[PDB]
Assembly symmetry: D2
């Protein structure tokens, strides 16, 4: 019976916020419901772009933002002085484009930052390390629509009841299991994996200790593979290959938001040499290898890396 | 503008049917919508058991049914005499159990067969090779809901407009791509694959012709991985392993209906040694290893198998 | 559990129909859902024109239609030859215009007739007395959406479950109450009523038998006031006045279909001098005064009319 | 593009409210959407009571109330000390019961009050005159679902987009037309009307000045007849008859909330001798004759009354 609006509103009162951030989040939610309806093809009797147009618009109207970065735009959107609020938002309107046409789960990922600089708003305002995130999360358009919000005191999962257009709290304080039995990677790149990644895979299939082999799962949508990682445990890997030197997934709105959710839930997120949330961005569309999930599974792979010095 | 309701009514007419089989499809459709709405969690403020009850119940009220086989039931279900029809229906009420809790795509699989017999309806009526199907179909509850239906005439895809509860033809007389670039399998069983499967995988990662490697995709729900296979091309496979020697997927309401759809769409479906559609089942819950998808992809693998048997 | 889709398919079968007319109902249903969703303002974040386009378009794609008459069109619409069927359809796409803006109940009225002729389909095919209808029906977009359908066999009501886009039988073989207690008319035209209507009203407020006065109800939408009349009993009336001498409501897609439903349900429908169903129209947009509802109520009024003509 | 949540939230920030009232209104809205879905019979493949159970529950959880009065309960609901907020709410969960079964428009009416007394919460806390209302309004389940909210600075109309479960602002600052051409009453009681009511009707049908006669309309649901009055202008009348000496409609949750909406929109609401909002309630289920709508139409009838001294 507890709804996202009420949760968000409450959290607003504790913090003693002025109402801007709350406003922002209500706005986000609404955009998410408008995308969910669109993705379930209501009125079917473009998608990548509809999404973006929605997140941009509803965000601007929140009067809570000053800088926007979307995976759909070369340049940072600087907001009109008259709609200008204090937050910097980095979103991925519709994540999982390769999966759109085959009807497989796709999502929306976001990250909220606070204007640090005291100068005119600009792209550098979104080049803050993931560690500075105030809020981060995602909406999965799967069998059902779900919004996962992460904030300092934890990760919570709200189910969208499309009947009355309300997200309902379904999981109180998500924590990922210490150790899982599922691995996610696209193994199509085997020929260009680095030595650590290569050795890790072998262990998941031929465990030296003779334990059960991990199961494999890779939806092809970061948002779906990641959500499963949070919920079932296990590991997700989009490492840097020879064809994609710096990884494929993008730091600001794909790597950072999900890293934050992972740690806030007791998991880890690393590039293999460094915590993702600690990297200082040099480009709003930068890419960075990513490995995330159960603390023990990630740690194991890190040990292989240092072992490969 | 062409609704599924319209499509089936027209098809039944062109076939000069008595409407029983047309009723059947309508009922299967109504159930799909019902299952969809529940899966999307409308009214939230077990999913497998509900799906099953809906199908069993709808199929009975159809008055088109004589025998039913659910993956949810130890034994076939024989329809009471006042409600009997000439049709046998093999269904998997909700496929992709491992993905339910994590909100990934899941679906409903179905296959339909005419009674082959004069005698009291029994289990035996359900033990017909996939080649004998009248229609095979799957509903996918993914980003959007899709119902795919295959009949002697071809494969068609309909999207569910949840705004009006209607399925709308979106892709007509669908044909799978001859050769793809995406391979779908659970590599976790690697230690247990046979030499052919193993050789094949290596070949998707390290192509001898030095071309670009196939990309990998494996949702975990046979309805999801198969649908993508139909629409993007490529190949899907769930071969035999230790835990399941004979394959995991079930012949009657998993392999057969998908192999039917896949072949109507100009694709292949093999266990590795024979055509899935030609196996004569002897147990309604029988399992079978399966390889399906684009012709050149399954063929390449079949050649690896033949190459090993030939040695 | 009995859907409208199922009901019509079964009915068509029992009638041994070729399915054309069955297709027609399906198409009318699909349109109703479509109109409903628009009326409920889904996707908001002209209603009369949209309704019309939907119906005209759906009815044509049905391939069951030869001629169409819309209250929205100056002239009958003749269906192109490749899409022709044997059916003539008189419809009012959205009834209750005065109530649209204020969000009160509005609906869609329809009547269906077989072509009576050998000759090129024309307007003339639509000029058949209401007695000649195969089916008459109305969808009410009120608190909930309801589709009422009447055929030679009776009147049935189906509720729209918008969760699954399906109409569900809720009231079967409906029969209007013999005598009611609610009278429905626009008393604003009082200065212009004829002596009978006037006497009658006075009689509902000051009953000579000293019983309790009928209560008054008048929504302004003929679909709303008629539906209530069918379900609670009582009487509805829109007689002749100065601004409309011949009555306001239209014979073909307002009076006729409602009189058909009302009679199948054991009720009456008169202009005051004759049965609405028996008038032979001579203009597709012709008007007629109407009195309908419970038998004893319309009869009481008819007696007042006869009593004046007799003097 | 402006939603009820954002409007309500904003108004919250101007007033510099602590968030309780805002919370309350978000709660109300949600209850209203849950009733709308129920009334459109979603899941049909009791109503009077479902409604009440919803309004009670969601209101209690708002933590914004201390006293509730529903047309469905003999006694005032006094809220548990631990969920106790400062507001007193008077609602009519589902108005138009006689109309439920025939599918004709029905609604939900509410009125919000502020705890005046400093003693233990009790029924007297809801016996405040309508004039003290802080907020009042209604939700009409018609062809479409609409929420009309009235508050000190005006009346606004929000359309419920059932697609994404959001009310959308559709009318900025409602004002009723000075004069209408529609009258609403149940004329079935003609034999027990008082002289003023009787004479008024005659004028609407046989205007002495020979002008056009008013049209008649009476849905049978206060919420529908009243909403039409607001939107098209004209008059609505549920006068006291001989069979119902004090009127039928009830002061706290039927007469008062709609009076407030009417005045706040430039119209009038009277019992024929007195402004409705000025009556001091002596019972939570009291009844009081009501006449409301266009200022000129109501005033005309008042003149007949004083003329009938
Ligand atoms: N709705 C909310 N939920 C959680 N934290 C919030 C909320 N509103 C404000 N805060 C915290 O308080 C700060 C000030 O909020 P504001 O004045 O609304 O910008 C934010 O940076 C948050 O860290
Ligand atoms: N709706 C339909 N779509 C496709 N084929 C049909 C349909 N109805 C009947 N048929 C064909 O005609 C046969 C007899 O149908 P029935 O009389 O409905 O049992 C079926 O087994 C179908 O192969
Ligand atoms: N779905 C149906 N419901 C009721 N009667 C029908 C139906 N279909 C056909 N009939 C009866 O059979 C006649 C021939 O129908 P058709 O062959 O569909 O044009 C119609 O005019 C109806 O009176
Ligand atoms: N959301 C709101 N909209 C309009 N007025 C409000 C709102 N919140 C508070 N107010 C006004 O400010 C007072 C204090 O609100 P609160 O502290 O939230 O109880 C209320 O009695 C209202 O008169
Ligand atoms: O096909 P690949 O290289 O495995 O890419 C999969 C990834 O691509 C993305 O679409 C990034 O564009 C992610 O959403 C997903 O995780
Ligand atoms: O999890 P595994 O062993 O890879 O098997 C996955 C398969 O399980 C199934 O649920 C069959 O039971 C299929 O839907 C899916 O393809
Ligand atoms: O407003 P009036 O003149 O009372 O007429 C009301 C009638 O108008 C109509 O809209 C006919 O045009 C009917 O739906 C309704 O019964
Ligand atoms: O049938 P009557 O006496 O005109 O009552 C109509 C009124 O009754 C009520 O239902 C009050 O219970 C109102 O909603 C409506 O305005
Ligand atoms: Mg994107
Ligand atoms: Mg992305
Ligand atoms: Mg199942
Ligand atoms: Mg299955
Ligand atoms: Mg119209
Ligand atoms: Mg009309
Ligand atoms: Mg009530
Ligand atoms: Mg009431």
């Amino acid at each position: 019976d507890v709804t996202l609006t009420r949760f968000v509103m409450e959290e607003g009162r504790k913090a003693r916020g002025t109402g801007e951030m709350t406003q922002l989040l209500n706005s986000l939610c609404t955009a998410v419901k408008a995308i969910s309806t669109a993705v379930r093809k209501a009125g079917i009797a473009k998608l990548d772009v509809l999404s973006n147009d929605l997140v941009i618009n509803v965000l601007k109207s929140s009067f809570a933002t000053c800088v926007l970065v979307s995976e759909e735009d070369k340049n940072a959107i600087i907001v009109e002085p008259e709609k200008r609020g204090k937050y910097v938002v980095c979103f991925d309107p519709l994540d999982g484009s390769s999966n759109i046409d085959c009807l497989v789960s796709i999502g929306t990922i976001f990250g909220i930052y606070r204007k640090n600089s005291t100068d005119e708003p600009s792209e550098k305002d979104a080049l803050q390390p993931g560690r500075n995130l105030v809020a981060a999360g995602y909406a999965l358009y799967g069998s059902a629509t779900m919004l996962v919000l992460a904030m300092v005191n934890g990760v919570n999962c709200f189910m969208l009841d499309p009947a009355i257009g309300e997200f309902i709290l379904v999981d109180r304080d998500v924590k990922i299991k210490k150790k899982g039995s599922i691995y996610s990677i696209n193994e199509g790149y085997a020929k260009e994996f680095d030595p650590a990644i290569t050795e890790y895979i072998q262990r998941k299939k031929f465990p030296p200790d003779n334990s059960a082999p991990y199961g494999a799962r890779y939806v092809g949508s970061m948002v779906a593979d990641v959500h499963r990682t949070l919920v079932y445990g296990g590991i997700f890997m989009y490492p840097a290959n020879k064809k994609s030197p710096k990884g494929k997934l993008r730091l600001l709105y794909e790597c950072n938001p999900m890293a934050y959710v992972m740690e806030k839930a007791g998991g880890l997120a690393t590039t293999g040499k460094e915590a993702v949330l600690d990297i200082v961005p040099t480009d709003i569309h930068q890419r960075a290898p990513i490995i995330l999930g159960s603390p023990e599974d990630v740690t194991e792979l890190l040990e292989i890396y240092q072992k490969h010095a």
